Design a protein around this ligand. Structure first.
Ligand SMILES: O=C(O)[C@H]1/C(=C/CO)O[C@@H]2CC(=O)N21
Ligand SMILES: O=C(O)[C@H]1/C(=C/CO)O[C@@H]2CC(=O)N21
Length: 420
């Protein structure tokens, strides 16, 4: 088991040797912090990306020593020690060609090693935050509950809704009303905000249903999700919540697009008061009227709106059901297309000798964080873990490394917590 000096050395060597988009970006960002030029910056970041002042302030906190390095596809984390035992984390999020979309340097997110489920509960609890943890083993005859806190509580789940969108899509593929190689087309009206990269494509860009669905899940691409929802139609997306496991489908009807959550949640306050006042008919009518090119920008987001219904609400059982349904859908798809999409991005570095397959999905919105995994071993034993937080203030939740890291520690301690 690596001692402190061993782990920091291994992290440092791995960062230097990491021949990948994350390795390239992580090494470059570390150089900004440890060395002594607007063109080289602009070339490292997304085209639509103050920063000089940001970097100056970062550098004032050093010198930094690399203590841990956690590359995970387009997401990365570097744990740094500064003078006097003070630790920070550098977080990277990349686009599809390895340009930096998000780069932060923040106080360290501390997650202790978990021995018991009570460790989990006591670590996670935050006054003013509602949380829920649900862990099950799936069996032919129902689910064995390993741990449960508030699974029956419906909570906002952000892009976890894209699990239902995926199931709706597979349902239509099986019916032959849509094809994996059918072409979807990006239009101004169909463009949404990040998470994702597809919004950065030119108007009129032609993309397959397959690659759109891949990015919708793997990159949580909001524009990719909105492209699929547009192609399927809202009625088809909705008329599948009942089939695909949902305790109260009325909570997601109308089943909002990401464009719609963004535009309604952070646009015109009167239009938002109209939603709150309206019944299902008036809300469908409001959304039809709102249809068009977004006016809301990422800079407008902040206040929480999930408490108004402007999010996607589900209970922990619903999340287990849709993941279990996806497992089944994947198994029926002899082409492996569904499986490849579901497994591309497991959200963590996974022990592949232990786990044959891992599905993952996150959701986040102001005041909302969630992570869920389905992990199946090589004997075919499946576990699902569902972690959720909601609050009236986004600062009580933070950037989601906490909740993800809790999952990470649970999964690390699987022989204690999951498979004991
Ligand atoms: O895909 C991920 O891992 C992203 C995400 C996407 C949800 O929009 O939300 C959580 C917060 C974060 O960085 N995670
Ligand atoms: O393996 C872990 O402990 C956690 C972590 C914690 C940050 O120090 O970073 C990686 C991403 C994640 O959830 N893992």
């Amino acid at each position: 088991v690596p001692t402190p000096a061993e782990a920091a050395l291994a992290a440092q060597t791995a960062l230097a040797a990491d021949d990948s988009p994350m390795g390239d970006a992580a090494r470059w960002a570390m150089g900004l912090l440890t060395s002594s030029r607007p063109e080289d910056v602009a070339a490292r970041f997304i085209p639509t990306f103050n920063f000089a002042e940001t970097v100056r302030e970062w550098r004032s906190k050093g010198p930094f020593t690399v203590r841990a390095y956690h590359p995970v596809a387009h997401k990365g984390w570097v744990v740094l020690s500064a003078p006097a035992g003070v630790r920070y984390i550098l977080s990277l999020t990349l686009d599809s060609s390895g340009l930096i979309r998000i780069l932060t340097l923040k106080p360290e997110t501390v997650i202790p090693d978990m021995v018991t489920w009570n460790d989990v509960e006591e670590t996670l609890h935050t006054p003013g935050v509602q949380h829920s943890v649900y862990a099950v083993r799936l069996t032919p005859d129902g689910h064995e509950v390993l741990h449960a806190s508030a699974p029956e509580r419906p909570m906002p789940t952000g892009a976890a809704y894209k699990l239902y969108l995926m199931r709706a899509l597979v349902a239509e593929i099986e019916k032959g009303t849509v094809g994996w190689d059918e072409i979807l087309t990006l239009t101004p009206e169909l463009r949404s905000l990040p998470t994702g990269d597809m919004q950065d494509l030119p108007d009129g860009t032609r993309v397959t249903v397959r690659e759109t669905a891949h990015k919708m899940i793997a990159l949580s691409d909001n524009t990719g999700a909105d492209l699929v929802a547009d192609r399927l139609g809202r009625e088809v997306v909705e008329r599948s919540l009942a089939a695909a496991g949902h305790h109260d489908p009325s909570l997601m009807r109308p089943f909002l697009t990401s464009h719609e959550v963004f535009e309604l949640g952070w646009g015109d306050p009167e239009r938002r008061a109209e939603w709150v006042r309206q019944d299902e008919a008036g809300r469908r009518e409001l959304l039809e009227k709102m249809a068009g090119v977004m006016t809301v920008r990422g800079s407008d987001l902040g206040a929480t709106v999930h408490q108004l219904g402007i999010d996607w609400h589900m209970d922990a059982f619903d999340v287990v059901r849709v993941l279990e349904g996806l497992l089944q859908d994947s198994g029926r798809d002899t082409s492996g297309t569904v499986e490849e999409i579901l497994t591309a991005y497991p959200g963590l570095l996974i022990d592949e000798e232990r786990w044959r397959r891992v599905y993952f999905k996150a959701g986040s919105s102001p005041g909302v964080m969630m992570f869920c995994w389905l992990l199946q071993d090589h004997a075919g034993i499946s576990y699902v873990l569902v972690l959720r937080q909601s609050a009236d203030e986004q600062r009580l939740i933070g950037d989601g490394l906490f909740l993800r890291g809790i999952g990470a520690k649970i999964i690390e301690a699987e022989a204690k917590l999951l498979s004991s």
